[PDB]
């Protein structure tokens, strides 16, 4: 990675942390923030290290590769490289495969990241990776938000935990998520809780909803 | 985080420590001081990393989101942003969502935290998070302080441990807590201890109370 | 903490070390030196972090709070704060609650600790905490030094281990401890060892006493 | 290793990480990226340390030695050393065995790596090692890509995981790998999935293929 | 400790390492080199931290205290402190209890250790501690070197391991140790090995002795 | 150790790593590269720390002592110390026991290692230690290379693993090792493999030999 500047290897602990996270949690949604934290200041070389150290899950890892290549091709369309000899005190313009670290060297990556103005190839590549990880989380989610229904003796808190877990795995925008919360949460609550939540009105906070259905 | 200045990634150990704390202790009151210690010098990006790495407990995490948004909206009311182009050698004034790290970049966060005078967005956001965590601790507390009663063969020390554990989870002010201690502790002690503690008078320290009921 | 100067967060390992020490050893006497080592260079904020991260033992932790408040009130009596506006290039004089970190900020704590001359608020607060921890160790000690008696088939080394373990938990001064050693150790040894130790005379070292009763 | 410059020992954690990786994963393909990450900035001395700390697998380790010697001999052919006394402020030209660290000293390795222009002997030797590791991965792969066939009740995702795991161990070029994907994946799918994938046409992404055969 | 200069706290890992060593190995001879390594650059405060963090073994720890006090009293005899006010840019001369860290402050310890010329109070105190630890190792050794005799079917290597383990715990000088090796090792070997070793003559190395009795 | 310069203590992790390596692997050949890596930049004091922290194996550790003394005596013969007072800005010439760290101080060791020109006493002593460790590995090897014979149903890969494991423990030169490989490997293979390997001719690589006998 790079930190406030200087380059260094990914630490053994960071490497092991990532490998173990994937071994333990597969593609539960919280893996993505963990990936992002473990890859802080990463060069594309470091990001490829992290992805290539995953054994198994090779369908997911292939899907990620295809997503990356799609984003790289889009970058190339928007940023076509201009022909000419690179001047003294200048860097060549990166293509998509340079950002993804397959056709660039570490020095070139360092060159772009530490240039003035900077070309943050590590952060660009990370956005592409996270887009691909989000697709995998979606695909690997066992359940739909439409099927989350409170059981007749289920504590409301447990139902809400299942609701918001499933909502998190959905790849719908924030406005759609708001509609899901406003509509389904109360609609798919059990008869007694549902009646109590409708009495609160559509202005209630989750805290107030949870407090209301505690006794039920 | 930032430390005496320079920015760096949250360490794998810090990340793992937080994840494991939540896995093991859920929302026992001591989790909050642990959160605060693990988030020392944190930018809002780092604070979101910590909260987003939690898998499960998504009712609690949603309640926390709602608390954050409430505090952000209050900030916006008290600190309305003034229209105009930002001068050379100046930072734009942060709105609530900039403090909570959803509409600001890391450089902007670094910019505010290291400015002269500083705008400590990390510490402001942390106060909002801790307010939300305190609400969750309250809500998830199984017991009321009014129901803590010493058993007829219960060592006074064990009763006092249960009393002060339950008191800690109550979200009443320090003056109310003082009344609880002065009134209930002795009132809800078992017959023999209760008689002995009333004989000490209302000036006794906890040490003296504990020593008095040792033999009982 | 602060180290030779610069401030930084308490490390996750330090935090975990302290939590685990308390989980494992409760209030055995060796916990106090461990506390002191783990809190080296600590600000009052860091010291409160350490104490607040303890879950359970809330009778002990309340006793500690009361001890701290007693020491803070004594500080206030000896060091009454003088009214007036604080000059440029000067620090306000700390009251007891500033030393204990409940009414002071981290910058103010840093301000006092790094001032010339220094006001070591962290070390002052640590002495108060250790006074309180010593009271808890005393109170939680199961045994009195007067009751430590060598069994008729007990190796002298095992008896001496029990003697000095119990002596360590007593909160009597060094002169009283010397009397206990000079008087009780030999007095409460078993018949055969006791006779052998009285023959050595009152000038014998512990090494010589232990060697003498090896064969017994 | 060397990091942005300064030399230092390989850390105990790096050493242990490598030893344990080999103990646990043998020569699964992901071991190679792990080797590369753990050997970041390595001198040839450090690389030999890593390889020599492996106990067991001595057939593989001998094959690696032979691969290294082959690459060293090729280097010598392409870069024959010129006779003459080495000038003040100059380094002798490295032969293959100097790059592999058997006839050079640590200072000489440091000398080449930190020279202007640099002669990155660590990175050259690492390419040779990885060539040898790739040969071992190939040789130790239990299965051929031609034999990966979806079972009649096998989830398509599981079949794809096995396909891309086996493909990764093949030491065929990227163009051959593309042919394998375009031809075999669909060809060796089970009757019902195979029919569904042929209906998608040869433009489908893996995501689309996986989604199509979810219900099957 | 102090390292090339700057002071810092003993690390949690160092603390834990020492505690665990004592828990696991008690007073086997190798504990002393481990103590010495873990206490590298230690101030007397750090050395007391290490000794005071030991729970149990309080007979041994008391014997150590008595040994320390004996060495402190000897220091005082050889180095009597001269009366007078300490000059600007000068340090007071340490007494035995200042070296052992009970009557000196950390700053004073730092003062002596970093003075020109240095007064290495940490290293002086460490020699006293190691003298005391050696006495404990001796006292706690279960066996005498005179009783180590090779069994009639015991591999010579196992006998030699027991011999040199027991020899290490003896607190006799190097010349006495040489006599023990030259005399007893061969004398207390089993009949067949003993005959073979006497045939080698008194010039044989241990390697040659071990090789000679391999087949036996 | 010393690192690019500055001196510091051996880390607790390094110490523990070495102790555990010896506990787990005894004197398997890979222990020596591990020793060398863990002792990088070591002073003789640090090297003695590492050797003295070993509990048990005291026959081996005595053999190592004798090997060290032999090398020290050889050093003394080749480098006799010249009588005279040591000049300002000069170091006394080290004798063998100064190199082995028994008659020199840490400052003197630092003095030699950081002098211009340097006298690398740590690296010299390390060569002596490794010579002694190699003697122990030889002596403790259970098997001879002449006795490694492929079983009639043994996979060739398993036979080759045993061959090269045993070869590694032999203390014969590289030319002798080459003869062993060229002669014995094929000679001591099982009837069917042996016939197949003789058909390849004496130019075959190990990879080619292993591939040839895969089906057998
Ligand atoms: Cl995995
Ligand atoms: Cl998953
Ligand atoms: Cl890679
Ligand atoms: Cl790869
Ligand atoms: Cl850009
Ligand atoms: Cl970047
Ligand atoms: Cl569900
Ligand atoms: Cl969780
Ligand atoms: Cl909870
Ligand atoms: Cl995040
Ligand atoms: Cl998230
Ligand atoms: Cl502000
Ligand atoms: Cl802040
Ligand atoms: Cl309770
Ligand atoms: Cl606890
Ligand atoms: Cl206790
Ligand atoms: Cl706190
Ligand atoms: Cl708290
Ligand atoms: Cl003061
Ligand atoms: Cl302080
Ligand atoms: Cl007892
Ligand atoms: Cl292995
Ligand atoms: Cl393998
Ligand atoms: Cl090596
Ligand atoms: Cl080797
Ligand atoms: Cl080159
Ligand atoms: Cl290199
Ligand atoms: Cl398969
Ligand atoms: Cl212990
Ligand atoms: Cl012992
Ligand atoms: Cl202490
Ligand atoms: Cl103590
Ligand atoms: Cl001195
Ligand atoms: Cl010192
Ligand atoms: Cl024995
Ligand atoms: Cl051992
Ligand atoms: Cl062995
Ligand atoms: Cl030592
Ligand atoms: Cl030793
Ligand atoms: Cl030399
Ligand atoms: Cl050296
Ligand atoms: Cl074998």
Numbering used by the authors:
A (entry chain A), B (entry chain A), C (entry chain A), D (entry chain A), E (entry chain A), F (entry chain A): 1 to 4, 10 to 221
Report text from the authors:
During maturation of human immunodeficiency virus type 1 (HIV-1), capsid proteins (CA) assemble into a conical core (or capsid) surrounding the viral genome. Formation of a core with optimal stability is a strict requirement for efficient HIV-1 infection. CA folds into two distinct domains connected by a linker: the N-terminal domain (CANTD), composed of seven α-helices and a single β-hairpin, and the C-terminal domain (CACTD), composed of a 310-helix and four α-helices. The cores comprise ~250 CA hexamers and 12 CA pentamers.
The second-site mutation, R132T, located in helix α7 near E45A, partially restores extended water-mediated interactions impaired by E45A. Additionally, there is a decrease with respect to WT, in the IA at the intra- and inter-hexamer interfaces. This suggests that R132T may at least partially decrease the excess stability of the hexamers and hexagonal lattice imparted by E45A. Notably, the altered α9_hex1–α9_hex2 inter-hexamer conformation in E45Aa with respect to other CA proteins is restored to WT-like interactions in E45A/R132T. In turn, the R132T secondary mutation in E45A/R132T appears to restore the local structure to WT-like conformation, likely enabling unfettered access to the PF74/CPSF6/Nup153 pocket. As in P38A/T216I, R132T, reverts the E45A assembly morphology to that of WT CA long tubes. Addition of R132T resulted in a decreased stability for the E45A/R132T cores, albeit still higher than that of WT, especially at later time points. For E45A/R132T CA, there is a loss in stability (Tm = 124.6 °C). Nonetheless, the ability of the E45Aa CA hexamers to translocate ions and water is recovered by the introduction of the second-site mutation E45A/R132T. In contrast, addition of R132T to E45A reverses the E45A changes, leading to similar inter-hexamer VDW interaction energies for WT and E45A/R132T.
